[PDB]
Amino acid sequence: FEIKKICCIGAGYVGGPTCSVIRVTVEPGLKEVVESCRGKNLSTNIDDAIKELVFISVNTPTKTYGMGKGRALDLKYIEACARRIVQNSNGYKIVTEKSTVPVRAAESIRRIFDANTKPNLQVLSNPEFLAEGTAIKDLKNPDRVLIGGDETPEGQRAVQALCAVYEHWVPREKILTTNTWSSELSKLAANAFLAQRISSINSISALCEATGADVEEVATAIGMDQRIGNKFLKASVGFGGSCFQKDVLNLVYLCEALNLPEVARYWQQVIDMNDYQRRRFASRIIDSLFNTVTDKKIAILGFAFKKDTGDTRESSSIYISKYLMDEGAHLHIYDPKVPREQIVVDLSHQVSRLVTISKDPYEACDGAHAVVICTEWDMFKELDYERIHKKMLKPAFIFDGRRVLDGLHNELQTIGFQIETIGKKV
Amino acid sequence: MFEIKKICCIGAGYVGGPTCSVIAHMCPEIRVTVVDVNESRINAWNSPTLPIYEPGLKEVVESCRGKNLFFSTNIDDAIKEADLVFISVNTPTKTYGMGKGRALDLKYIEACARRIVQNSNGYKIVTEKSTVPVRAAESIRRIFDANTKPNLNLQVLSNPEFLAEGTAIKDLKNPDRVLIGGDETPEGQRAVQALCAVYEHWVPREKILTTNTWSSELSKLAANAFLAQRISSINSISALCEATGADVEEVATAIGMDQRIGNKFLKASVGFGGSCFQKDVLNLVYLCEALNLPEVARYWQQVIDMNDYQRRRFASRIIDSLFNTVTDKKIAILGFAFKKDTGDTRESSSIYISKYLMDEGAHLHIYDPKVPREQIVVDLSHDQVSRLVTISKDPYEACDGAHAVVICTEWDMFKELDYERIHKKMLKPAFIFDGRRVLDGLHNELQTIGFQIETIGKKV
Amino acid sequence: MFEIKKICCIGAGYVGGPTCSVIAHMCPEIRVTVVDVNESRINAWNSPTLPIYEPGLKEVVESCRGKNLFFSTNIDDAIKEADLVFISVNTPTKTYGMGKGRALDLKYIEACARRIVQNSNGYKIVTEKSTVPVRAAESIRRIFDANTKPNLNLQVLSNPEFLAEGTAIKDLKNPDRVLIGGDETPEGQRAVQALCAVYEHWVPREKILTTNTWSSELSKLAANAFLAQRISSINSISALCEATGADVEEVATAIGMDQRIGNKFLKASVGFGGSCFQKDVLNLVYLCEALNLPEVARYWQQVIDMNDYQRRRFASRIIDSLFNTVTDKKIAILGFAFKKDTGDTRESSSIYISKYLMDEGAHLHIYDPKVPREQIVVDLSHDQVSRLVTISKDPYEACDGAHAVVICTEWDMFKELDYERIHKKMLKPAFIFDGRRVLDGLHNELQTIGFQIETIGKKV
Ligand SMILES: NC(=O)c1ccc[n+]([C@@H]2O[C@H](COP(=O)([O-])OP(=O)(O)OC[C@H]3O[C@@H](n4cnc5c(N)ncnc54)[C@H](O)[C@@H]3O)[C@@H](O)[C@H]2O)c1
Ligand SMILES: NC(=O)c1ccc[n+]([C@@H]2O[C@H](COP(=O)([O-])OP(=O)(O)OC[C@H]3O[C@@H](n4cnc5c(N)ncnc54)[C@H](O)[C@@H]3O)[C@@H](O)[C@H]2O)c1
Ligand SMILES: NC(=O)c1ccc[n+]([C@@H]2O[C@H](COP(=O)([O-])OP(=O)(O)OC[C@H]3O[C@@H](n4cnc5c(N)ncnc54)[C@H](O)[C@@H]3O)[C@@H](O)[C@H]2O)c1
Ligand SMILES: O=c1ccn([C@@H]2O[C@H](COP(=O)(O)OP(=O)(O)O[C@H]3O[C@H](CO)[C@@H](O)[C@H](O)[C@H]3O)[C@@H](O)[C@H]2O)c(=O)[nH]1
Ligand SMILES: O=c1ccn([C@@H]2O[C@H](COP(=O)(O)OP(=O)(O)O[C@H]3O[C@H](CO)[C@@H](O)[C@H](O)[C@H]3O)[C@@H](O)[C@H]2O)c(=O)[nH]1
Ligand SMILES: O=c1ccn([C@@H]2O[C@H](COP(=O)(O)OP(=O)(O)O[C@H]3O[C@H](CO)[C@@H](O)[C@H](O)[C@H]3O)[C@@H](O)[C@H]2O)c(=O)[nH]1
Ligand SMILES: [Cl-]
Ligand SMILES: [Cl-]
Ligand SMILES: [Cl-]
């Protein structure tokens, strides 16, 4: 068999870029690749696209209701696709799961297809591993491509059909084929391992503040062991993004459902440590400002969950801001890329009384008691802090939640700042 | 401006011996004296049979023993003459009192500090090489300052060791990094830079990391904790794989191909062993509680709880598969060392799996190709060992008339055994419990032979 | 030898007013200016009717107001010319955020410190008189140092107040002790001695206690906690008495005759009230948690828990005695102030007893001979107050047709009521719940009348 026509249900943060990179019917450099394929081999006419490989790339948010609230994934969008696919299909076609789903979700899709059969739909798993802000580079040269299918003669042929698609630009040795369940579980486990590195280095940062060690020195020493590696060891106010907390909590929920309470509380610590890192950072700001920040002006420099993006989902800036808002602080928030309308939505259910969105950092720091850096934007390293200090109330504080001002502490102390950062004793 | 010409190392053990032997091999113009109180251990270093077995160690000592490397019992004289003093004594877990089973016993470290400052005059650099709790150098600096002399300048540095068992000479000659910690003071940097010059004889400068004293001490603890956390994490996944139909080896491969995660230390097992992983993680946990960091303490405690859970559930799997009773049943234990290609049994998972089965009254026949039988007898004691434990001479003796074969160590020979022969003389039904994934790919044959084979991270 | 000649006090409330009035009365050659942002309160000090009532206070102000005692709204000038600045502003319990219900809100203190260091030049002594958390003076010193000027020398002292309601003038003129805390430095000791000289005009030298700044702040909190602990301890005994047949009044007398224990503050009650006991104990508990002293925190938490338990069990006793339902029943609440001879109701046990009975749907008729009716409505509000709460203007109206009479405040008139008249118009059986032991000695006469009389610390 040879795949010649590909359909992708879901043109969002994932479905769009993946298919942009065979008649395929559905970030820096993304606008360039689409323009080279739109019209030759690259609509809302969903049924005909199905009726002529089908990628499922719809959202799977954490359930905010009912049983499993705040932990389980909501599969209602996935099932809607599966019903619509089997309605419009005859013959052979390959349905491929790309959304991040719980383990054994493909069994549900196969149940729907078999119960609505006609006088041959193969289900595969193909998770996504791109990271926001670097998606195009990750899609062009991925670390690995993961494809899962059943270990039957019918299933193994569907795997090879999808492998042939990726082999046009992915080396054969970078394409890993496993069973359906191992593929789904690997996506969840991969994100848990990444988040665990951040929570582990953040746990060390608390130890450093109490011992006089430095988390940047410790991370470097840890990272030079090639069995550990030097990636994802940057201590921070807490990891954000739309997938780390969601996938770990889903993993925890899956373990509780499968009667693995030891495994559930093992991975629960990744989330608990991240929450503790946020709460103690907020309490440090509040304590340094003499235990009261009512009507005090505080500058929030950085609102995105990481640099070089406008995404704010589960950003630590949201939680740090809400902690200070509960104390009645006057927040002046600047982010060079996050839309100002988004900041208002994130801090909403108080926003009118306490939250002001500044158009430049110097406006936000004018007359403020403290500067709180939550995002590692490169521009924060280059601000004129002697100018900022002149218009700040005294004493003036800088709370660096990202280690971006390292090496600048002596100058900032000479200017008159009390500078505090994560993983460094005050 | 200073140059270290004479080195003394207090402690001629697994660390002091090989580290100083390698330092002498790369530094011909520097005398290295390794001292110890143990008289028999010192003479064994000057014997043809070295007290510790390390591949390549015997040849390195013999090329320097006599030139610039020496072993001796004269601790006071070696300290008097040295420009650099290594503290490489043991720091065992306290088995008593406050912090029992978690905190480190610093009595040997303090004895060194007392003996050093007494037999010392002038300028000397004292370097912590043993695994010590964070801020232990502060205690050493207090002992030196409270027993000072005119024109006595003792500088304290931290220089932890990261060698592993079986590849120490390989690790010492080509380290991933050399870690040195000292003060920010002018005296501190000069002592740090003097020790850098020693390592620069064979370690590139980009691989020599200098930090403050506390970061150095904590990094040794944190490094071992991060490594053990990877094993417990992949072991937690192995439990998930067994309950979902996934395979932990396939999942580990998929995870490890992310270059931010890396593909090392993802081999699921019945549980990690060795003399330092559980010891350093628990010490980390104890330090956090003492510093009022309960969140950090219970975070790293999960690494130990997961390792313990992996062991217990494996023993429960054996008992449950054997019709919920193993009383008076013969069970073969293949592998007793905590890893392959060694005779070390410290904190080996085989000890705990055996004790679980011994508590049920099972008749264990234990075979290990490298571990001495007297060590196994000591490990399973506090009798019970006489009634239940038999140490076999080859795997076929241990499997003769047994209900199950339990593989706990990844010895390569276990993969190459005659299982048709073992199956014929085993009681039926015959079980294989693979706690190391060493029999992967052999499941079809073993099942065709008639075995019920069960392994970690694979649905039965 | 520095000499304090002009005193400014920021805060003309219950503390700042009387304390400065007494200082002016006893120190005729010292100018005393009490300032405040509330103009209606400042004018009330200058009017022939004071804002706060204390016996003998009206005579003190009228004897000084115009000579050396002044009440102005010009805060900046009073700070400018003062040698000593009292901070006597409110420090309420935080009702929001971290530490809600336990920590103190320091925003008013900080407002003073910033305004002082802006309107100050030269040498000035700044004195904490408000009840502040421990190390609050460290925060004031940071504001002063971070906003320093040339020739600006601000010294920070602690000087808490211990006056009680009803005896403020007596306590200020003849205090058990005057407590002054300052830094143990020559600059601090000089500032301490200058403030002692002011009090030395009428306080014996041995009654003026000088400590470090932190001991002074902590002593204010601990003193109130010790007093509240005596009440909770004797209240805990009252529960034991009810279950054993002992009498809490006999036990308290027997305990109190030990001169090491003393006979003060051993009067069992439905629970202590007032604006400072619960707030200072809870603040102490919060301080111990922030400093990682959980044993000390739960030790002092027991004072509050026992006070809450004494209240809840008294309410449950009323409900249980009334055949387990009080829905739509008329209940008379005699006494709403937190103690007799005052109209203050802050944290009054009557508030909590009333809310418990309101949650059951009882019809409360509340009488207090001094509390304004509008205050009672505010205290019992969040509706529920309109349906259930009636404010009577004499006790007999409140007891007319009621099932029970609940005495929560020890007003002397409640002992002198006509209980035969009350019994005739009460529903039967008629109950009296004495939460203050005010009807002691009347139990036989009340039982003969037909009442079921129940009181704290006496078996029924
Ligand atoms: N960095 C990342 O964002 C990323 C990377 C890897 C994996 N993932 C996973 O990939 C999935 C895609 O999420 P996303 O971030 O791209 O969100 P998204 O914005 O793409 O949301 C899915 C969108 O699909 C559209 N859609 C089209 N047809 C639909 C249908 N029939 N039913 C429902 N929706 C339909 C909807 O408009 C919806 O907003 C998630 O499960 C996510 O966890 C995300
Ligand atoms: N793989 C490893 O075992 C390894 C790896 C890195 C670091 N470390 C750490 O290095 C340290 C050294 O461990 P080891 O395995 O070499 O221990 P060891 O048991 O070999 O002890 C070292 C030697 O010190 C001697 N000694 C003790 N007190 C002495 C004193 N007062 N004077 C003279 N000699 C004295 C002992 O007799 C012993 O022979 C430990 O704290 C360990 O945690 C171990
Ligand atoms: N018996 C007692 O009530 C008593 C006994 C000892 C200690 N204390 C403590 O004394 C303190 C004051 O108690 P109080 O009952 O007198 O309070 P209060 O509310 O009666 O008086 C405080 C006064 O300060 C004024 N004020 C507040 N902030 C100001 C500012 N920035 N500038 C100028 N004026 C300002 C207010 O308007 C008010 O008139 C509290 O901390 C209390 O705990 C109380
Ligand atoms: O050393 C680090 C690395 C990251 N972070 C933070 O962790 C969060 C996640 O960062 P990153 O992983 O780059 O962002 P994502 O876009 O969420 O990418 C993750 O989530 C994707 C969706 O599941 C996966 O495909 C990717 O592999 C995985 O990296 C951000 O708030 C970062 O600031 C740290 O605090 N320290
Ligand atoms: O993927 C893996 C890797 C290791 N292990 C187990 O982990 C334990 C320890 O393995 P290893 O790291 O080789 O042991 P050691 O030889 O004691 O070395 C460790 O302990 C030393 C003592 O501190 C450190 O210096 C080294 O850096 C550190 O690797 C053994 O029981 C292994 O079976 C696994 O189960 N899975
Ligand atoms: O044996 C006793 C003594 C008192 N109380 C109760 O305790 C509370 C407090 O009474 P009291 O101490 O006289 O009232 P306050 O006017 O608040 O005075 C206290 O609170 C002040 C701070 O506000 C301190 O300065 C005083 O020293 C301290 O007595 C009231 O509800 C009393 O009914 C009892 O129940 N039993
Ligand atoms: Cl230090
Ligand atoms: Cl203990
Ligand atoms: Cl299956």
Side-chain angles (χ1 to χ4, degrees), chain C residues 10-11 13-15 36-37 41 89-91 108 130-131 161 279:
Chain C
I10 311 176
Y14 191 32
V15 171
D36 201 313
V37 292
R41 170 166 288 187
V89 297
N90 43 316
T91 57
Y108 304 103
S130 307
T131 295
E161 217 54 42
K279 157 178 88 68

Side-chain angles (χ1 to χ4, degrees), chain B residues 97-100 102 286 289:
Chain B
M98 301 222 180
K100 180 186 179 182
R102 297 175 301 159
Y286 175 82
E289 296 172 347

Side-chain angles (χ1 to χ4, degrees), chain B residues 446-459:
Chain B
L446 295 168
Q447 283 170 353
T448 295
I449 297 178
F451 285 108
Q452 179 173 329
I453 168 170
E454 299 187 22
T455 188
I456 282 165
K458 188 173 186 296
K459 194 178 192 173

Side-chain angles (χ1 to χ4, degrees), chain B residues 318-336:
Chain B
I318 297 162
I319 301 166
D320 287 336
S321 290
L322 269 51
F323 310 131
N324 308 282
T325 176
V326 303
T327 311
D328 298 312
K329 293 194 182 180
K330 184 183 183 180
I331 297 177
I333 303 297
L334 295 195
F336 209 79

